[PDB]
Design a protein around this nucleic acid. Structure first.
Ligand SMILES: [Zn+2]
Ligand SMILES: [Zn+2]
Lengths: 142, 186, 241, 113, 269, 119
RNA sequence: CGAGAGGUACUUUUCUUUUCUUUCUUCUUCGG
RNA sequence: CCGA
C-alpha cells in the first residue's frame, strides 16, 4: 500500500518549535536510492523518475554494463546543469519518458525560432504561446 | 475547600509560572539577531540556546525593548493563570462576588491575595536587577544581577523584572518584599 | 474644558514602560502641541498602495523592500578590522585597509562593488571633511590582499583606500589620516540616506488618514535638518520607490 | 596605534618613512636611533562602535531591532492571525525567502513563503 | 462491549488523577482500574472537564455504568455521567487468557519438502496480545534493553496450524503462523494526571529490522511456541484460515542464511 | 471573477545538483503530500455548508489545491491545516468506516437515484 | 505682618467571556 | 502505465 506520512519523518516538538524526526525508514530509503540494490551479478543505479512516477512513489533504475553506464544514459538525454532548482531538475529528467511512438529524425539545421507574443495587463504577466507551434500540411502526413 | 485542593492549586500555579517563563523566553527570540535560528533550517545551537535560563533574564533587564516585548508576553500568558480563581473558588466567595458585581476590586487583586503576586516591574532604569529566584541562595550569589555588574563587559543600568511565586497570604520573603517595595515605590 | 480637565486629574501619572509614556503626559503632549520647536524628531508615517495586494504576501515584501531601501546603514557596521599598511608611481605611502567578511555583505544584501560605489558617492558629494590637499581618492576592491599582518580570514574581502597627493609629502602624515580620513568614510552610509534614524513596520487597526473603502504601515524617524529644508521635502527625495 | 620601545633610550618610537630608501623606519625622538620596522603595520583596530561607555543600557540604543508582525495570515496548527515575518536565507538556496513565525504561545509552528 | 475505556462526562477541574482513582476504587473493587487519563489544554497545569478511564474487565464496566445511570457516583458534589469513548487508552485485549506472557517466539521457513522448520533466530520471554476488536496480533520482543513491537494483522495470516515441539501429539506446545505479507515493526523511544498502572509512558515509531542477522525480513513463516496449549485452542480458533488438525514438525538448524545487506531475501550468487 | 495564476517563488541554489538533492526531493515527496485530501475536503465543505463554492473555507481549499498541484514543479508543500477537515462524510462516498451523515445536497439525490434504479 | 518646618489631602480608577486547538495513521480528480 |  501507499507509504503514509507517519511511517517516516515523525514530528516531535523539541526545544521551542516542532521538528520532524527522520526514523530508520528514512535512512533506509535514502541508502537504497544512494547505493542501490544488488541482485545477481549486477547493481541497479538511480537513473531518473517520470512525472507520474513521483506521485506513485516509483523510480527507474539501470545497471552499469560494459557498453553503457547509469551516467551515460542520463547525459544522453541532455545537460541539466543550467537548472538551479531541485524539483525542476528532477522534473525535466522525466519529461523524456512518455509512452510514445517514434518517427523520423529532424536534423539540427531545420530550426526556425519565431519571436513569441505576450500581454501584461494590470501588472499580471500573461502569455499566449505556452507550448504551441507550427507544422506544415505534408509534415502531418509524414 | 480543603488542604488537597490548596496543594493542587499551588502545584498548578508553580507550573503556570514556569510555562509563562518559557513563553517569555520563546517571545524574546523575535529579534533581528536570531533570524538564522527562527528560519526553518539546520541549527547547531538549537539545544544550547534553550537551556540559557539566566542569560535570557540578564539580557531581558539590560535592554529596554526586550523587557517591553516580555512584559506583554507575560501579561497575556498570565490571563490563564488568573483564570484559576473561578475553578477553585466557590460561588459564596466575597471577593468573587465583589469582583463580578464591579463594586470594588477585580480578579487581579484576588490572584495576588490568594495564589501569587505575579509580574513585578518598574518603568525606571535602576542600577540593579533581579536574580530570577528570590530565595536565600539568590541573594548571596556574587555573579547575580542584584549586586551590580555581573561581568557578561560591565553593566551600567538595569530594567527590573521579577516574578514572585509567593502571595500575600502565605507570606513574602525579605528579598521578595524588597522587590515589591522597589516596584511599588513609584 | 471641564470635561477634559476631569479626565486630566483622573489619569495615571506613572509611565507604563521606558519606550512609552504616561497617559497624562500623552494628553499633555497632544494638548500642548503648538510649541513649533523641540527635539528635532519629526516622526512620519508612510502607508502602502492598493496594487501591492495583487501578489502572494505582497504587502510584507513591499514593506521589507521599503525598509531595506530607506534605512541608514553605516560603513562601520559592515567592516570588522581596519588597518593602515605601508605599501611601498605609488604616490602614497599610507593605504587604509578595510577587511569585510563575506557573511555580513550577504546578510545585509550588499556586494563588494556597491560599497565602493556608495563610498565614492559620499566622497564626491560631501565636502565636510577638512582639506588635506586631496585631488582624488580611488578605492580598489580586492578579494585577497597581500598584507602579511594576520591571516585569520580566508573567506573575506578587502577594501584599499588610497589618497592622491599633489606631487608632494604634505598629505603623508599619519595622524591626520588616522584622525580625519578614517572616521569620515566610516560614518558614511552604504545603504539608505544620511538623515533617517530608524524605520520600523507596524500593524494597526484604527489608523490616521483612513482609506476610501487592519493594514501594515511604516513609521519613519528622520534626523533634524539643520538647514532650511523640511524633513518631508527630504523624505520625498523615495524617488526610486 | 601599535607602539614599540627604544633599544637604549627605552622610550616611545615614531614611524618615519625614508623617502630616499622607500622603506619604513622607527626613529626615537629623544635619542638618535633609527630602528628597522617589521611587516609595515602602523595601525590596527577592531572596529567597535561602543563610543557611549556606561550609558548605552540606560536609554534604548536599539542595537538589536524587533521583527515586524502581521495579522493578514493564518497559521496551520492554530487558527491565529498574528504572526512574525522576517527575511533570511535557506541552507543551500541563493537569494532571500520570506519566513513566518506564529505568535500564539501554544502553537510553535513556523513555515516559509 | 468491544472496548472497556469509559469517558466520564463531568469531572471537577480542581482534582488530580489519584483522587478520582481512589474514588473509583472505593466505589468499585480494589485495583480494578487499569488506565486513567485526564486531557490537558496546557502542558501540566490545566485539566479539562472530562476524563477517560479504562477498566480491567467488562463486568466492572457494566457495574460502573449501572451505578452512573442510577445516579450513585457523587464525587465532590458532582454526579459522574459515563458514556462511550472513541478508542482504548492502551491497545490491550480485555481477556486474562489472551495475554500470553513469557513465551518462546521463533522465526523461519519450511526448509525441505516435508513440514519442517529451520530457525534463524530465537526470542525468549516475549509477549503476545491477540486484539480481536482491532483485528491484529502484536508481540513484544525485548533485545538489548529496548523492546520492538511487531504488529501482525489478520489479513496477512493465511494458514494457522497447531504444532508440537516435544513430539507427543497431546503436548501441543507450538502454533505455526504463515504470513503472506510482512509485519509492521515498531520501536520504543524515550506525569501527574496519568496513573496507567504500568510502564506505558513512551511512543511507537516505525523503524527497520532490529536484528543484527536480519532474520525478520526473510521470516514469512512464524512458530509461536507456547508453554502449555490445552484450552488455548478455543482462542486460536478465532484466527482466520485455521486448519483444525494437529501436525508435527522438525526443528532444523538454520543459522546459515545470515546476510548484512539492506536487501535481505536474496540467494547467495 | 477568476482567481490568481502566479504560483510560489522558485527556489534557486547557489551550486549544482550533487545527485543527492534529487533523492531528498523524492523521499520528502511522500511526506507533506496532502493532495489526496484537498479535493475531498472541498467536496464535503460544499455539501455541508450553504452558499457552496463561495465561502472562505472553499477559497482557502481552492488556493491550496493550486499550490499542491505545483508541488511536482516547485518545492513548495501544501500544508493542509487543522480545523478544516470535515470529520463527517456525505452519502455519496465509499467510506463505510467514518461516522457518515445523510447528504441533503444534489449529490445525495444523484446517489439515491441509482439505488432507485438498481432495486 | 513676612519666612523655615512638619501634617490632612489622587482610593483599584480599567483585567477581560472564566467555555479558544490534539478522537489520532489515512482514498487527488480526469482520458487512453 | 502514461499526459494536465
Ligand atoms: Zn587588506
Ligand atoms: Zn499558529
Amino acid at each position: 500500500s501507499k507509504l503514509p506520512a507517519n511511517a517516516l519523518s515523525v514530528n516531535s516538538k523539541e526545544g521551542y518549535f516542532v521538528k520532524p524526526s527522520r526514523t530508520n525508514i528514512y535512512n533506509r530509503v535514502l541508502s537504497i536510492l544512494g547505493e542501490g540494490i544488488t541482485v545477481g551479478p549486477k547493481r541497479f543505479e538511480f537513473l531518473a523518475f517520470s512525472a507520474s512516477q513521483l506521485r506513485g512513489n516509483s523510480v527507474w533504475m539501470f545497471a552499469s554494463n560494459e557498453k553503457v553506464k547509469a551516467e551515460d544514459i542520463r547525459e544522453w538525454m541532455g545537460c541539466f546543469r543550467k537548472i538551479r532548482s531541485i524539483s525542476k531538475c528532477a522534473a525535466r529528467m522525466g519529461q523524456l519518458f512518455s509512452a510514445s511512438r517514434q518517427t523520423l529524425i529532424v536534423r539540427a539545421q531545420d530550426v526556425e525560432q519565431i519571436p513569441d507574443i505576450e500581454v501584461t495587463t494590470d501588472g499580471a504577466d500573461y502569455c499566449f504561446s505556452d507550448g504551441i507551434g507550427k507544422i506544415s500540411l505534408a509534415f502531418a502526413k509524414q | 475547600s480543603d488542604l488537597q485542593s490548596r496543594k493542587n492549586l499551588t502545584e498548578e500555579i508553580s507550573y503556570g509560572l514556569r510555562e509563562a517563563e518559557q513563553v517569555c523566553n520563546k517571545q524574546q527570540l523575535m529579534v533581528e539577531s536570531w533570524r538564522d535560528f527562527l528560519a526553518v533550517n539546520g541549527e547547531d545551537k538549537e539545544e544550547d540556546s534553550v537551556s540559557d535560563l539566566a542569560r535570557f533574564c540578564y539580557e531581558r533587564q539590560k535592554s529596554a525593548t526586550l523587557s517591553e516585548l516580555a512584559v506583554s508576553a507575560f501579561k497575556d500568558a498570565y490571563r490563564d493563570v488568573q483564570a484559576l480563581a473561578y475553578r477553585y473558588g466557590d460561588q459564596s466567595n466575597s471577593f468573587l462576588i465583589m469582583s463580578k458585581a464591579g463594586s470594588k476590586g477585580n480578579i487581579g487583586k484576588l490572584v495576588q491575595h490568594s495564589m501569587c503576586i505575579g509580574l513585578q516591574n518598574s518603568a525606571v532604569s535602576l542600577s540593579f536587577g533581579f536574580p530570577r529566584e528570590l530565595t536565600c541562595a539568590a541573594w548571596n550569589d556574587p555573579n547575580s544581577p542584584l549586586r551590580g555588574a555581573k561581568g557578561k563587559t560591565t553593566t551600567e543600568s538595569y530594567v527590573p523584572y521579577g516574578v514572585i511565586e509567593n502571595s500575600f497570604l502565605t507570606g513574602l520573603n525579605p528579598l521578595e518584599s524588597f522587590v515589591h517595595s522597589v516596584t511599588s515605590r513609584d | 474644558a471641564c470635561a477634559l480637565s476631569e479626565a486630566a486629574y483622573s489619569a495615571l501619572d506613572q509611565p507604563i514602560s521606558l519606550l512609552e509614556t504616561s497617559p497624562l503626559l500623552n494628553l499633555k503632549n497632544v494638548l500642548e502641541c503648538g510649541s513649533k520647536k523641540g527635539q528635532r524628531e519629526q516622526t512620519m508615517s508612510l502607508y502602502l498602495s492598493e496594487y501591492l495586494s495583487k501578489k502572494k504576501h505582497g504587502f510584507e515584501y513591499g514593506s521589507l523592500e521599503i525598509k531595506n531601501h530607506l534605512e541608514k546603514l553605516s560603513f562601520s557596521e559592515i567592516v570588522s578590522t581596519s588597518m593602515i599598511i605601508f605599501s611601498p608611481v605609488p604616490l602614497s605611502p599610507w593605504v587604509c585597509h578595510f577587511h569585510i567578511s563575506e557573511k555580513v555583505l550577504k546578510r545585509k544584501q550588499l556586494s563588494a562593488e556597491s560599497v565602493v560605489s556608495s563610498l565614492n558617492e559620499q566622497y564626491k558629494s560631501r565636502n565636510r571633511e577638512l582639506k588635506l590637499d586631496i585631488v582624488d581618492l580611488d578605492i580598489q576592491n580586492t578579494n585577497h590582499c597581500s598584507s602579511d599582518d594576520q591571516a585569520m580570514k580566508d573567506d573575506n574581502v578587502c577594501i584599499t583606500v588610497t589618497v592622491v597627493e599633489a606631487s608632494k609629502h604634505s598629505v603623508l602624515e599619519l595622524d591626520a589620516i588616522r584622525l580625519v580620513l578614517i572616521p569620515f568614510l566610516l560614518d558614511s552610509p552604504v545603504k539608505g540616506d544620511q538623515g533617517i534614524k530608524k524605520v520600523n513596520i507596524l500593524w494597526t487597526d484604527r489608523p490616521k488618514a483612513p482609506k476610501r473603502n487592519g493594514e501594515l504601515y511604516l513609521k519613519v524617524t528622520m534626523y533634524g535638518d539643520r538647514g532650511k529644508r523640511n524633513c518631508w521635502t527630504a523624505l520625498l527625495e523615495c524617488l526610486p520607490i | 596605534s601599535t607602539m614599540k620601545f627604544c633599544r637604549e633610550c627605552n622610550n616611545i618610537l615614531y614611524p618615519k618613512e625614508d623617502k630616499e630608501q622607500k622603506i619604513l623606519l622607527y626613529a626615537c625622538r629623544n635619542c638618535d636611533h633609527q630602528e628597522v620596522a617589521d611587516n609595515s603595520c602602523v595601525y590596527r583596530n577592531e572596529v567597535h562602535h561602543s563610543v557611549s561607555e556606561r550609558t548605552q543600557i540606560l536609554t534604548d540604543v536599539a542595537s538589536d531591532p524587533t521583527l515586524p508582525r502581521t495579522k493578514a495570515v493564518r497559521c496551520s496548527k492554530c487558527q491565529h492571525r498574528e504572526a512574525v515575518f522576517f527575511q533570511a536565507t535557506a541552507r543551500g538556496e541563493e537569494g532571500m525567502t520570506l519566513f513566518f513565525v506564529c505568535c500564539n504561545p501554544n502553537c510553535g509552528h513556523r513555515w516559509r513563503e | 462491549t468491544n472496548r472497556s475505556t469509559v469517558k466520564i462526562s463531568n469531572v471537577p477541574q480542581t482534582i488530580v488523577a489519584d483522587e478520582l482513582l481512589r474514588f473509583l476504587e472505593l466505589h468499585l473493587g480494589e485495583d480494578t482500574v487499569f488506565a486513567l487519563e485526564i486531557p490537558t489544554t496546557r502542558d501540566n497545569w490545566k485539566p479539562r472537564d472530562f476524563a477517560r478511564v479504562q477498566f480491567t474487565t467488562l463486568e466492572v464496566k457494566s457495574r460502573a455504568q449501572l451505578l452512573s445511570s442510577q445516579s450513585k457516583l457523587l464525587f465532590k458534589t458532582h454526579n459522574l455521567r459515563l458514556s462511550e469513548a472513541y478508542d482504548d487508552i492502551i491497545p490491550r485485549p480485555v481477556d486474562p487468557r489472551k495475554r500470553l506472557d513469557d513465551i518462546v517466539l521463533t522465526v523461519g521457513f519450511p526448509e525441505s519438502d516435508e513440514k519442517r522448520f529451520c530457525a534463524l533466530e530465537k526470542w525468549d520471554g516475549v509477549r503476545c496480545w491477540i486484539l480481536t476488536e482491532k483485528r491484529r496480533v502484536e508481540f513484544w520482543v525485548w533485545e538489548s534493553g529496548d523492546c520492538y513491537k511487531i504488529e501482525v494483522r489478520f489479513e496477512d495470516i493465511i494458514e494457522t496450524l497447531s504444532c508440537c515441539v516435544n513430539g507427543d501429539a497431546s503436548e501441543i506446545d507450538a502454533f505455526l503462523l504463515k504470513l503472506k505479507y510482512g509485519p509492521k515493526v515498531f520501536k520504543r523511544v524515550t506525569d501527574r494526571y496519568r496513573f496507567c498502572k504500568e510502564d506505558f509512558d513512551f511512543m511507537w515509531i516505525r523503524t527497520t529490522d532490529f536484528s543484527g542477522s536480519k532474520s525478520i525480513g526473510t521470516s514469512t513463516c512464524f512458530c509461536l511456541e507456547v508453554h502449555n496449549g490445552s484450552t488455548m485452542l478455543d482462542i486460536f480458533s478465532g484466527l482466520p484460515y485455521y486448519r483444525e488438525d494437529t501436525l508435527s514438525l522438525t526443528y532444523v538448524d538454520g543459522k546459515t542464511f545470515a546476510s548484512a545487506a539492506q536487501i535481505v531475501p536474496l540467494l547467495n550468487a | 471573477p477568476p482567481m490568481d495564476y502566479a504560483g510560489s517563488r522558485p527556489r534557486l541554489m547557489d551550486h549544482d545538483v550533487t545527485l543527492e538533492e534529487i533523492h531528498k526531493f523524492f523521499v520528502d515527496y511522500m511526506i507533506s503530500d496532502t493532495l489526496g485530501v484537498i479535493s475531498t475536503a472541498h467536496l464535503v465543505h460544499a455539501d455541508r455548508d450553504p452558499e457552496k463554492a463561495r465561502s472562505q473555507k472553499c477559497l482557502e481549499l481552492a488556493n491550496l489545491h493550486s499550490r499542491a498541484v505545483d508541488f511536482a514543479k516547485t518545492g513548495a508543500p501544501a500544508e493542509m491545516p487543522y480545523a478544516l477537515k470535515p470529520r463527517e462524510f456525505p452519502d455519496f462516498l465509499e467510506r463505510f468506516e467514518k461516522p457518515t451523515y445523510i447528504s441533503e445536497s444534489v449529490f445525495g439525490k444523484l446517489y439515491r437515484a441509482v439505488k432507485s434504479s438498481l432495486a
